[PDB]
Structure formats: structure tokens, C-alpha cells
Amino acid sequence: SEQLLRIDDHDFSMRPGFGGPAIPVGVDVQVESLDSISEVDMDFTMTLYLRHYWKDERLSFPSTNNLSMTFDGRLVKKIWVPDMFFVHSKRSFIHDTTTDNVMLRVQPDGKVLYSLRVTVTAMCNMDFSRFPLDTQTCSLEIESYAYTEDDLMLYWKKGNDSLKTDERISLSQFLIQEFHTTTKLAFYSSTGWYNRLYINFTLRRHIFFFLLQTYFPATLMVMLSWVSFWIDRRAVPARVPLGITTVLTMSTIITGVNASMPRVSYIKAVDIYLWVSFVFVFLSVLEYAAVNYLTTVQERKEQDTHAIDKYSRIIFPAAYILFNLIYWSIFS
Amino acid sequence: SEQLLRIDDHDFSMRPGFGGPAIPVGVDVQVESLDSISEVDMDFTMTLYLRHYWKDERLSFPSTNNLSMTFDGRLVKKIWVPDMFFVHSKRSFIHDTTTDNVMLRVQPDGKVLYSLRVTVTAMCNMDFSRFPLDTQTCSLEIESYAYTEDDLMLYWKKGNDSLKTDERISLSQFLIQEFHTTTKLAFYSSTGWYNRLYINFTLRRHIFFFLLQTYFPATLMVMLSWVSFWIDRRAVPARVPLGITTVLTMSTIITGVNASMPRVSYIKAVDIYLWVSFVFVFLSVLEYAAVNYLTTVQERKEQDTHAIDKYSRIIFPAAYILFNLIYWSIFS
Amino acid sequence: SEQLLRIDDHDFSMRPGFGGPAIPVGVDVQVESLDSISEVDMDFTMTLYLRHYWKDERLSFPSTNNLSMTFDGRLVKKIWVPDMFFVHSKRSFIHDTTTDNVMLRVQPDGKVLYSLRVTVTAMCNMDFSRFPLDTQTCSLEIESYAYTEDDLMLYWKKGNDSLKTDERISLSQFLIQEFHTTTKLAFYSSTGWYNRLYINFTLRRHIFFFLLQTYFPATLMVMLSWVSFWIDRRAVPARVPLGITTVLTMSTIITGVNASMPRVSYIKAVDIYLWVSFVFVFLSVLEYAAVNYLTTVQERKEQDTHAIDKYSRIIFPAAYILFNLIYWSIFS
Amino acid sequence: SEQLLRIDDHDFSMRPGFGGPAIPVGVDVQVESLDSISEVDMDFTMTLYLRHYWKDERLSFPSTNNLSMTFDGRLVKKIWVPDMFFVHSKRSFIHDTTTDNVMLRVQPDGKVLYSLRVTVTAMCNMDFSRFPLDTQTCSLEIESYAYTEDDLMLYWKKGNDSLKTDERISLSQFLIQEFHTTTKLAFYSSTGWYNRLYINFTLRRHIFFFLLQTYFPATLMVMLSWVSFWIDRRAVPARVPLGITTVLTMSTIITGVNASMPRVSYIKAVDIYLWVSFVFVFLSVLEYAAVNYLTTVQERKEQDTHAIDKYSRIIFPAAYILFNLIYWSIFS
Amino acid sequence: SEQLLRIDDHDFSMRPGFGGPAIPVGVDVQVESLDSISEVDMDFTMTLYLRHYWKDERLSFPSTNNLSMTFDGRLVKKIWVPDMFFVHSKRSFIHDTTTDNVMLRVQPDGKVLYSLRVTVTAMCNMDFSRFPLDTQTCSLEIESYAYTEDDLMLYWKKGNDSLKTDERISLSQFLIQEFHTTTKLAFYSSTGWYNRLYINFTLRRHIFFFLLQTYFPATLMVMLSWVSFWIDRRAVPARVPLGITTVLTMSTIITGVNASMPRVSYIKAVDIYLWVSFVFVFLSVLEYAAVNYLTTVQERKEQDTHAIDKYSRIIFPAAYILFNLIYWSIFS
Ligand SMILES: CCCCCCCC
Ligand SMILES: CCCCCCCC
Ligand SMILES: CCCCCCCC
Ligand SMILES: CCCCCCCC
Ligand SMILES: CCCCCCCC
Ligand SMILES: CCCCCCCC
Ligand SMILES: CCCCCCCC
Ligand SMILES: CCCCCCCC
Ligand SMILES: CCCCCCCC
Ligand SMILES: CCCCCCCC
Ligand SMILES: CCCCCCCC
Ligand SMILES: CCCCCCCC
Ligand SMILES: CCCCCCCC
Ligand SMILES: CCCCCCCC
Ligand SMILES: CCCCCCCC
Ligand SMILES: CCCCCCCC
Ligand SMILES: CCCCCCCC
Ligand SMILES: CCCCCCCC
Ligand SMILES: CCCCCCCC
Ligand SMILES: CCCCCCCC
Ligand SMILES: NC[C@H](O)CC(=O)O
């Protein structure tokens, strides 16, 4: 094998066909798993198989079998091999247990297949201002490092059919949909033009979990705060603790929701809901102070429900309804 | 030794017997420990010994002893060795202190034994919708990377007896049961067919700890909320703070249970329990407002227990009982 | 190629032109992304491309094409290459998947271009005493390790135009502004003088998020504490729980704000706001004790609003206003 | 030196004396520090020096000095060296700054000394059911990987005197006592018999810190709940809030103790204490409801302390005392 | 250069002058930064430059220039170099981007200078029983690994002037003071005597931040608890909730201070303060129960301030004052 190929009779720092046109190289990918997601750092981790095809007649051998052979890794450092890399990546590695996950098959003609197994972490810019009703889209990019479109030609081996995805892929916090591929040509100011391949996909959440954990308790709190309009205004020590305890409860809920968020420092769509229900509860406590002050001054002036109570009984819910209509018209 | 074997007289990039049938290779495993589990990331970590057997007559030597020899590691890179790898793995390594944990024994015939010590992290898809009453099953998969069933034949060396497990294995959060092995043939669209080996096992939790920490306090809270049906309706400042303080207490408990969960964003079987006891406590606070409003309007109209109290005393517990029956009929 | 260049006919431990003047070396940078920031550890992480230019006539070759060639990495360890390093850095590495991200281009003259892809973590001293109204500025420094200004001359290749920045750069907690470059000469007491290059930039926060999360609820709490001046002093069991519950609420808010801060142990500008509103709420609770004690002793002496109430109704808000004026005159 | 020893005249893949009996190899250890402990993962980290002694007459040299020489590391890969490894370990490494921490001394006879500096993480099964009154014992195990008791003989160089421990060893959460060594012979089903060395030690906690942080506040809460037996039963709005606020306080304490525990999911000895004091506080709130209901029905029937109060004043503390006696008789 | 020095004509496994006396080697250090501190693990991280000087006439070359040359790294593995290491260290490394941060300068005589750039984590035993009023001192130790005082002599190159410290060094949680150096001779029982160098320094905190965050709110709580001595004893429903709410508030504060401490399990000087103010608040709640019980029994016996109130008004503060005097006499 090491003899079948005239390894010492050629020069492999030289791309196959240095001189005239660019070498065609064709790519095939199969995704094994998506491993983790960070919302704070804005990135994701994926593990896949990567395959390459090309022809190099320096590697042809005399056999009659019309069938391929096999090598692994050691030969990659003797021969010439392409040099793809992952664009917009934070870290990556190739697996090496119990030996290097690298495969090499060569036919009599010198046609070649070359394959690896890798894990990549790759950046994805996200926007959380519609949280928890956001949708995100991410991508993985592949490019040649050293050779430009004048020396190497990059393309998907079988067009739209060059991506395969494993059956058992899932996340404990997301739903994954819409895998597909595309291409684009890209330019560097000090080095030139290159071809680039993409893999795209889309993410969404489970909205009912967030509904019950956040929107439901605050609504029950705002509804608890309307009870005070139906209690006798003469019962001061039963109308005064109620409001302030309700404020305490709502502040506890809001604090509890703040101590578990992914810690991204700009205003999002649930913060608005929570702070508006805080303001409603606060107004309910101003109301009864108005009523008490007026009843007391009347008592002093002289020496039945109050108008403000029987008006609040109507006004407060209608305005909560009006707020909910507008809010869900804006975030749908 | 390096001379006993004609190392320079052979070619080891070539599998033993390149040409005709596939080489038989036989595997034996002993598990040392399970090291950690992640429920958020859905994976586990294990450490084991791995052993291989095969015959290669390029390694035979003239001795009369009918007994094996020993080498370690350096020789592995001179001779031909198989290339197994762990399928659906996130990371792994071989231990190297104070030197490489690799052993090699060769007999006069050229029969070989080869062994390593490794640690692997490996994915396991879990479903937590029955939490804390869930059960999970995981597995470790082993496969050849480079050679197909037409070049290498993978099998357990002794059938069902090829797995051994250490005596002192345990986790601080789980109970481990049912180790066994099996096999399956698997297919890759761009490379072909391979043999694969499995090791399976099962996990369960301690249910009484979760019972006392979560289900018990909420039940005592719902039972505390029924006390208010037996207090005099004329005692407004002693019936009004009770309910709202009880709501405060229950919200504190629920928040405390949310700040320690493994953070998996979909609805699970304990969330339902907690939110239904929240709704019961909320209804208890609506009840006394009904009673107060009615007594007040009667006082105004004119100028003994109330029916609603003596009806609630019966209705509320029966419905809690009915909820518990249905809930534990569904989750058993 | 390895032959075109007389590799074995020269000595590369020797800088080009050892002897007379210093070699000119010129630098070009393109920033890909800012990856993370730590406020506790005072540092940041960046990923970029780095490019070098120089001439070495040991690498010239006879060709007529007036056009460059290509190599990658392996050649870097055969020839002489500069040795820049990142000053005030905690950690860094060069990417190596699927091979080393290193490029090398040589023209017939022996002019050279050399480029890498790296990730660096680099220290930045920050001062948080104006938090959340702070502004920070950071920088990345580049220097030669081994050769002084008498052997190597470091400069930007194109002056102000030698820095390029990617379009899609962002952080989930900051706004980035004002990239520019400069230079400075620097001195080591036991080794001598060197040239150094800088890249500078500036950071700011989103102030409205911090406003709503911190300053707003405490203000509503201080305003809730003024309600007690308008309730009848004869209603002791409705004036005594109010203050103490309000104290409870404010302490809960402050504790909630302390359990999420970046944990830097010196006094900052929001702590002052929070503790002054604590002191206001505390004084409101001392006030009514004064009023109760005086009314009781008058009752005992003998056997209408009180002056202190109708004075507090004016004094407390004016002093809160006066505090806000001074505070926002100091932090603007 | 490299010449003094006839390196190229011998074969070092071959243990000294391959053939007849087993080589004696003798071990000496000095512990530098214990570095960290994990209670969740059940393991510890230690750093030490390790020393070996043996004789190999392939390394003898003609000198008259009767005194040893020195080498470092590079020679270890030319000559034959033993292959010990740490049994039941999760990770380890040898230090390499500013070069490899390896020492080698050889005398004229061929006697050898060989030493390293390493850090190891090693598993320790713990049982926390007596927490905070638990005691744990851990150990570090040392074994040959490749050679059995028929090829290598492992023993402590000086018996009980072969372990030394540094003066300045401590943990910020434990007290360390009782270092000693021992040996045992161990068996592998597919490879055979080996010798193994042990180092053992013991751990304990500071019990008074846990006492004040956990047992003290709950006791004061249970004692606060007995005050309600001495207040007038006619004071409903002063007897009804007291109990429920006390329940709130105790639930806050318990939640605070749950949010800081090492997160091991089975019942431990402090959980029992906390939940029994919860049940006592709950019964105190049922008591006054009994008293109120009875007084009210008597008032209705007709139209002085109550017996239940003056009985509870005696019964509740005695039963708390009886619980404490039994509890501290069981956990001592 | 590689020729100027007769590399192949000498033996470098042999220290310069093997035989007679010990080689003098002299050390110079410059500290770049202190990077982080762990109070739980008791250690710190530092980054510095390290320099060595010695003479070796195997490296002399014929030149007339009386001036030094330069090499980098590759030569270190051809020639003989010392072998210093950091004593009591947990981890360390040498920086290698964009190449190895190693410098080598040789003069015609064979005098040598050798320098590196490293980061070290190093243990420091701390005692927190005076927290937050503690002071700590730490050190970094440097020693030869392989050679004893009979083969190598270690000393500071310029005495007290051999340490330089960067201008821009700081921590976000500490103040750093008092850098200085010293030396000591040290002994190993199985290997012998060595020289060791030290760098020492001192740390302190910001005490006013801890004062406002911890001591201030508890004091205001103890002062709030004295208000109850001035309210009318006839106002039961206004004297009974006050105490218990105050207890709730103080327990919340203490829990909040426990959920952010560096988690070191022994009693410290702030714990005492907090638990004594807890006991004061608890006694204030026992007091009014005494007063109520006595007034009630007098009412029953028959059918103005109470003595206990007008005595407590004096006794409680004086004892708080007396506690503060003693406490701050003990911790100063
Ligand atoms: C499935 C639970 C839905 C809760 C909706 C609450 C809207 C305020
Ligand atoms: C919001 C509570 C209103 C209760 C009205 C009851 C009328 C029967
Ligand atoms: C960007 C608008 C924020 C509005 C916040 C309102 C809070 C009551
Ligand atoms: C928000 C309710 C206002 C009610 C005003 C009533 C004036 C008589
Ligand atoms: C062993 C404790 C069981 C608690 C059961 C509580 C069910 C509500
Ligand atoms: C739920 C408390 C009921 C108390 C009834 C007592 C009858 C003696
Ligand atoms: C998927 C059904 C959720 C029901 C939640 C009910 C909460 C009261
Ligand atoms: C859920 C209790 C309802 C009671 C209704 C009573 C109507 C008289
Ligand atoms: C957009 C919200 C602003 C809130 C300002 C609060 C100032 C106390
Ligand atoms: C701070 C509340 C004052 C209420 C006054 C109402 C006058 C109509
Ligand atoms: C450095 C001045 C701090 C002032 C704190 C005041 C808290 C009421
Ligand atoms: C801070 C308010 C003081 C009011 C004093 C009134 C004296 C009659
Ligand atoms: C040193 C404090 C001891 C506290 C004991 C509390 C027992 C309930
Ligand atoms: C294993 C016995 C648990 C008992 C728990 C009792 C809680 C009141
Ligand atoms: C636990 C106290 C029970 C008291 C019963 C009294 C019956 C008259
Ligand atoms: C600068 C604030 C000092 C606070 C001292 C509090 C002492 C109890
Ligand atoms: C601790 C509050 C005492 C108030 C006394 C007021 C005397 C005018
Ligand atoms: C070591 C003495 C501890 C004293 C604790 C006192 C708590 C009230
Ligand atoms: C538990 C408080 C009892 C108080 C009794 C006081 C008798 C003088
Ligand atoms: C701690 C205050 C004690 C007061 C005792 C008064 C006895 C008449
Ligand atoms: N295709 C990668 C670029 O050529 C690298 C660079 O920007 O230098």
C-alpha cells in the first residue's frame, strides 16, 4: 500500500494540478446531534460527520479490482488533503478514542474519499425582545482557509440531497425545525474571494409552560386586588392590611421570576406585563385611602356605598381588559 | 522482542488478511464506575476497561513456552490494531498516568490480547413528564470506524458472559438496575454496513424524599385553608388576613420549589399538583367575600351560620379528595 | 516548492539580515467577534485574524509569473517567522480544525505574507463606582517577545486603515463603540526597548432596563409610606401594621437586588439610593409612635389632626425631592 | 552519561530478568496537599510525590565514586521503567513547568531511584444519612497495570515508615485525621492477580456551626408558638394572625436551609428535625380553632381559661422534650 | 549559529562542571498581574516573567563584538537548561501564542540569559474567623527539582532589587500591599537539601461596604423592636403583630446574608452579631406576653404604665450598648 502509491516520487505541498484551473472538491454532511445551547453567550454546539471527494492521479495504483481500499490518518500527513474550517466558530476538535476518527478510501483511478468526526461550537446572534414568544434561526458555515476560488472549487456533492439528519435529535428546552443548505461567495479585503457553504435551521419554545409559570399568578393577584371594592368601608383594619399584603405577594412573585432568567440586560415582553400588574395593584391601595379620608372629613363636618367604590368596581376590570387586548394585539 | 517479531518484514497499514474474508474480532468489557449524570444536558459519564482479541500470524515468534509475553503502547503504533469508537459520545480520553494505561500480550501463535482504560460521556434521551415518578434507560454503543462488515466482524467474546460490573458502584441521586448486552447491524448511506454492540441499564429515583419535600407542605396548606369555615363571620379582621397570608405562604413554597429544579422547560406532573392547590387556596378567599357582602346587604335591608359556610365545610374537602383520586389514578 | 526554495542552503535561526539594521515588519488585523465579558474577573474575549508582511531573499525562486504561491503551517517550522505575542493576556490559542488555520504566500522576490486565526482573553481594569451609569474602555496590545527595536521594527501596514471590523458584532449586555489604533514604545529594565501596537474601544450599557428594575419599585415604596399621614390616628391597628409591612417589603426588594449583582465588594451609586429609601421608610414608622405616645399622655392628663401629621405631610416629600435633585446632580 | 550506559547494547521492552522470578519494586510516598472535595460527585483531589526503587544491571557503569548520578525525563523513554497507575481515579496528570517534574538517579551498581510529582482525583463512596453528624473514610489505591505478581512484586519500601505528610495541610470545611497504609492482593477474571497498596484517612465536620445555623432557629420558632396559650381567647384578631405568621416564618427558614444543601436526594437526619417542628407549629394553629368554635357554640346555647388552653400549656412542651430525648438517643 | 556553537561536540545531560562545586544560578522576577482569588479553595493566580543567568563555556563562540545574540525555544531542547519549579502549586503553564514565549541570549563568553512567561495557581492557607476584619498573607515559592545544594546554588541576582511589579495591578475585592523577597534552605527526607526563594505579599478588604450591607440593617431592626415599649398595653391587636412581623423581617435578613457567603463551615465574627440581635428581638416578644398575662389576671382578681414596660425602656438599650462595647473591644 505505502509502496503501491509512489509516495516519495511526488510533491504534496502542491495542490493537484497547480497551475491551470481550480480543483473541484465536493462535500457531504450527516448530523449526529445538537448538544447544547447558551442564550447568554449566543451560541450552540453540534456534532457531525464530514466527507470530501476529489481526484488525484498521484495516488493511482495498478490493480484490476475496480474497488476501493482503506487507510486511516497516518497517511493524511503524507499526502495532500484539503483544508476546510468552520467560519464563526468558538471552539472545535476531532475525536481520538480509541484512535483518530479519520477514514480514507482510494480507488485505482486515484479518486478519493476522506471523512472525519467533529464537534463544533458556533455563534448565533439572537434577539429576545419578544420573549417568551421569540423564534430564532441559526447556521453553520464551512469554508476553505488557504486557497481561493482560483485554486479550489467548493460545492455540495449532490445538491439538496447532501444533508442527512439523525432520527433521535432533540433538546430539553426547544423544538427544532427546517433543515436546509445553501451557498454564497464571500470576499476578504487583503486575501480575496472564497466559496462558502451553509446549513440552516430554526428554533421555537413551549409557550404553555411559560404561560402558567409567569402570566397566570400575576393575573390571579390583580383579580385578588379587586375584592377590596366589595368590603365595608367602615372595616378599616380589614381593608388596610389586605392591599399591602397583596403588594408584598406580587413583589415576591416578580423577584422570583427575576432570579431565574437568562440574564440579558434589556427590556422584554414579559417584564411589561409584570410591571403593569404591579401598577394596578398599587392604584388599588391608593383608592381606599381616598375613600377613608373623605369619609373622615365628612364625619368631622357633620359633627351606603361610597361613589368611588361603586365606580371602581366597573372601571378597574375594563381597563385591565383593554390592556390585555392591546398587549396581545402587539405580540400576537 | 522487537527482533523476535519481524516488524520491518511486513506491512501493517494492511489489515490481517486483506483480500478474502473479514477478520473476526472479539470484545470483552468490565465497568469500573458510573461517574456523573446531567439531566439538563441529557448524558452520563462512565469509566471502564476494554479488551480485544484477534490473530495475526505476522506477529508469531519461535518459542517453545506456549505462554504469552507483554508489551505496552509503543508497539501499538508499530503494528496493526483495530479502531473501535464510541457511538453517540460527547467526549472521551485514555488515562496516561504514570504512563499510558495500555497492555499488549502476544503468544507464539500470533494470537493477541489488547486492553485500555477509558472514560466516556455518552448521550441519553430522557423524558421527565412523569417527574418525580419517571424511569429512564440508557445505553453505550461500540462500533468500528473505518472497516465494514466485509472487512471486520465484531462480536462479544463469550456471549452474555462478556460483561462484568464492579461491586462498589452507586450514585448519590439514583438507583441502578438491569445491566445486559445486545447487538445490531447498522447502515450508513454514503459508507455502508457495520456491526454494533450495546450495553444497557436502567435508572430510578427515591420517591419518598420528593414526597416529603413537595407534596406534603402544600397539602397541609390546603388543609389550613379550610379552618376559615369554622370561625365566626362577624370577626372580619380575623377572617380577612388569614386567607391572604395563606396565599403568601403557598406562593413562597411554590417559588422555593421552582428555584431548585433541573430547569427543563415543559410541564411535569408535580407542577399540576402545586397549581391545583394554589387554585383551591384562591377559591377559599373568594368564598368569605361572598359571605361578607351578603351579610352586609341583609343588614342594610332590615334597617346563625351562613348557608355558604355550612355548605363549603362539606364541598371543599370532597373535591380535594376527588382530585387526589383522579391524579393518582393517572400517575399511579 | 520545497526544492524551489533552497531550504537546506540557509540558516533560519538567524533573522533576515542579522547584523546591520532592524527588519521592517508590518501588521494588519481584522476582528471577527467579541465573545464574552467578565465583570468580576475584569477581562474580555476576542477572536480575530492576524497578518504579517516582510521580505526575505533566502526564499526567492526563479519563476516568471510575478505572482504568489501558497503553503500552510508545515513550512513555518522550517523557515524563519516573527514571534509576536499578546501583552496582558490570560489565555489564547490557534484554531486547528480541520487543520491548522495558518496560511503562507510567497512571491518570486521573497516577499511574504503570513496569517493566523486566534482567540484571546485579555485583561481590562474597570471601575464600577458609577454603576449602572459607568462607561469602560479596553484595549488589546501586540508586541515582539524576543527581538528589540534594534533588531525588528513593528508598524501598522497601512496606518489608520489597518483595522477592519465585522458587520455582525454584538453583545447581549453592552453596546460597542469607537474602534481605533495607536502605537507606543515600551521599556523593560532587564531586557530593553520594544515597539507595541494597540486596538482600543468603548463600552456602555442600557440604562432604562436598570431604571425600571431598581429605581422604580423603591420609589413606589417610599410613596406608599406617605399614605399613613392621611389615616385617622385613632385607628391604631390600621396604622401600626402598615409601616412594618412596608419595611418588610423594602427589605425584600433590597435583598433581591443584592442576590444578582456581579459581586464586587465596594460601594456603588445604586446602593446609596436603596439605603436612603430604607431610611425614609424607617423614619415614617418612628413618626406615628411619637403621635400615639403624645395622644395617650394627653388622654391621661385630661382624665382634629395632630400637628406632627399635618407637618409631616409637607416635610417628607420635599426632602425626598431635595435628595433626588442632589443625587442626580452628582451622577448626572 | 548516555555513553557510560550501553543504551544501544540492550533491550528495554524487556523487564529486568524476563524469565525467572518477579522483580522487586519498592514504593515511597510523601503527601503535599489535599486540594478539594465534592460531596455531590463523591471524590477528592490530592497532590503528592511518588518514588520507586529497583536494580537493573543493564544500567551499571564503571566509576569508583560509590555515589549516584542524575538524569531527568528524556532518559525515561530510552530505558525500562515501571508502570504504576491509580486505581478508582477520575483524572490525573504530571506537572510540567518549567519542565517535567521527573528525577532519575543511578548508582554504579545499576540501582535506581525514580520520582514524579502528580495530582489525582479519586472516588470515595460517602453516606450522608447521619448528616451533619456523619464521619467518612477514604483511600488512594496504587497498582501495576501490565505485569502480574508473577512478573513484578510491589511493596512499601520501609513498611509503616513509607508515608510522610506535610505540616500545613487543611480544608476549609473538614478536619483530617488517621493516615496509615496497608496492602492487599487483588484478582481480575480475564487477566490475573496483582498487588495493591492503600493510603487511608478519615474526615469529620464542625458540628457547632451546623447547630447554630439549623437547629437553633427552629427551636426558637416552636417556643414562640407556645406563647399563644397565655393570651385571652376573647382576643380573636390577636390570636389568629400569630399562628399563621409563625407558619410563614418556619416555612421561610426551611426553604432557606433547602437552597444551600449539597443536593443529595435522600432523607437525612436534619430533615426529620425540621419537619417535626413544622408539624408542631401546625398543631398549635389547629388548637385555637377548636377553642374558638366551642366558645362560640356555647354563646349560642346560652342565648375563665378554657380547659383546652390550660391542658395544652402542659402537654405541648413535654411532647417536644420527649421527641428531643428520642432523637438524640438515636443519633447521639 | 547552530554551527558557531559546537553542539554535537559536547554532552548536555551533564550539568556544566559535573564533578567539583555547585553551579551558581541567579534569578530575577517581574510580576505582570494577579488574576483571581478563591476563598473556598484557598489559592490565587498570578502571571509573571522569570529570568535566569549562568555561564557555560560549552556555548562560547569566536566573535569580536562583545555583544549578545538571540535564540528561541528550539535551542532549549538541544542544550542544558536549569529545572526550576513552583512549590505548593495546583496548576501552571507557559504561553505559546503566536509561538513559545521563550527567549535565549548568549554572549561570546558563554554567559547566558534565559526567560519565560508563565501563569501559576498557588495555595495559600487562610483563616476567616475575624471576617470581615481579617488580614491574609500569601507567598510564591521557587525551587530546583532535580539538583541539590551540592550541585546547584540558587540566589536572587541583585538581592532586594530582584523583584519588579507592574503599575496597573488591582483586584475587584481586595487591596494589595507589601511585596518583598526572602530565602530559606529546605530538606527532604529521601532526597536531601535544596535552596528555596520566596515572594510575599499582604491582602485586606474594604470594611465599610460590609458594614452597611450587614451590621446596619440588623441594628435598625433591634431599634425598631424597642418601639413596642411606648404603645398602650390595652392595644393588643397592635402590639402582638408588631413583634412577630419584626422576627420575620430579621430572619429574612439573616437568610439573605447566608445565601451569599463564601461557604466556609465554621463560626465567624459576623454570625455572632446577627444571632445576638436575633435573641434581642425574641426577648422583646416574650416581654409583652408577660405584661398581657399579668394585666388579665389582675382584671380577673378585681372582678397607668406597667412596671415591666417602664423598666424595659431602660434595660434593653443599655444591654445592647454593653454588648457592642464588649464585641468591638474583642474584634477592634
Ligand atoms: C394552560 C394554562 C393557561 C394559563 C393562562 C393564564 C392567562 C393569564
Ligand atoms: C369580587 C367579589 C364580589 C362578591 C360579590 C358577591 C355577590 C353575591
Ligand atoms: C419601553 C417602555 C417601557 C414602559 C414601562 C412601563 C412600566 C409601568
Ligand atoms: C379610578 C376610579 C376613579 C373613581 C372616581 C370617582 C369620582 C366620584
Ligand atoms: C413519608 C412522608 C410521606 C408524606 C406523604 C404526604 C402526602 C401528601
Ligand atoms: C377545621 C377545624 C374544625 C374545628 C371543629 C372543632 C369541633 C370541636
Ligand atoms: C396541560 C394541562 C395544564 C393544566 C394546568 C391547570 C392549572 C390550574
Ligand atoms: C363551593 C361552595 C358553594 C356553596 C354555595 C351555597 C349556595 C347557598
Ligand atoms: C421607563 C421607566 C422609567 C422609570 C423611572 C423610575 C424613576 C424612579
Ligand atoms: C396620600 C393620599 C392622600 C389622599 C388625599 C385624598 C384627598 C381627596
Ligand atoms: C460613603 C458614604 C456612604 C453613605 C451611606 C449612607 C447610608 C444611609
Ligand atoms: C419630620 C417632621 C417633624 C414634625 C415636627 C412637628 C413638631 C410640632
Ligand atoms: C453554640 C450554639 C448551640 C445552639 C444549640 C441549639 C439547640 C436547639
Ligand atoms: C422515613 C421516616 C420519615 C418520617 C417523616 C415524618 C415527617 C413528619
Ligand atoms: C393536645 C392538647 C389536647 C387537649 C385536650 C383537652 C380536652 C378537654
Ligand atoms: C458608612 C455606613 C456605616 C454604618 C454603620 C452601622 C453600624 C451599626
Ligand atoms: C421609641 C419611641 C419613643 C417615642 C417617645 C416620644 C416622646 C415624645
Ligand atoms: C462560640 C460561641 C458561639 C455563641 C453563639 C451565641 C448565639 C446566641
Ligand atoms: C409563654 C409565656 C408565659 C408568660 C407567663 C407570665 C407569667 C408571669
Ligand atoms: C428585662 C426587663 C425585666 C423587667 C422586670 C420588671 C419586674 C417588675
Ligand atoms: N478564508 C480565510 C481568510 O483567507 C483568512 C484571512 O482573513 O486571512
Ligand SMILES: NC[C@H](O)CC(=O)O
Ligand atoms: N462507522 C462510522 C461511519 O463510517 C463514519 C461516517 O459516517 O462516515
Ligand SMILES: NC[C@H](O)CC(=O)O
Ligand atoms: N518583550 C517581552 C520581554 O522582553 C520579556 C521579559 O520581560 O523578559
Ligand SMILES: NC[C@H](O)CC(=O)O
Ligand atoms: N491491573 C489492571 C488490569 O490488568 C487491567 C484490566 O482489567 O485489563
Ligand SMILES: NC[C@H](O)CC(=O)O
Ligand atoms: N526538590 C523536590 C524533591 O526533590 C522532589 C521529591 O520530593 O522527590
Ligand SMILES: CCCCCC
Ligand atoms: C387612584 C384612585 C384615586 C381616586 C381619587 C378620587
Ligand SMILES: CCCCCC
Ligand atoms: C368561590 C365560591 C363562590 C360562592 C358564591 C355563592
Ligand SMILES: CCCCCC
Ligand atoms: C422621626 C420623627 C420624630 C418626630 C418627633 C416630634
Ligand SMILES: CCCCCC
Ligand atoms: C390539635 C388539637 C385538637 C384538640 C381537640 C380538642
Ligand SMILES: CCCCCC
Ligand atoms: C423576657 C422578659 C421576661 C420578664 C418577666 C418579668
Ligand SMILES: CCCCCC
Ligand atoms: C425613658 C428612659 C429611656 C432611657 C433610654 C436609655
Ligand SMILES: [Cl-]
Ligand atoms: Cl381589630
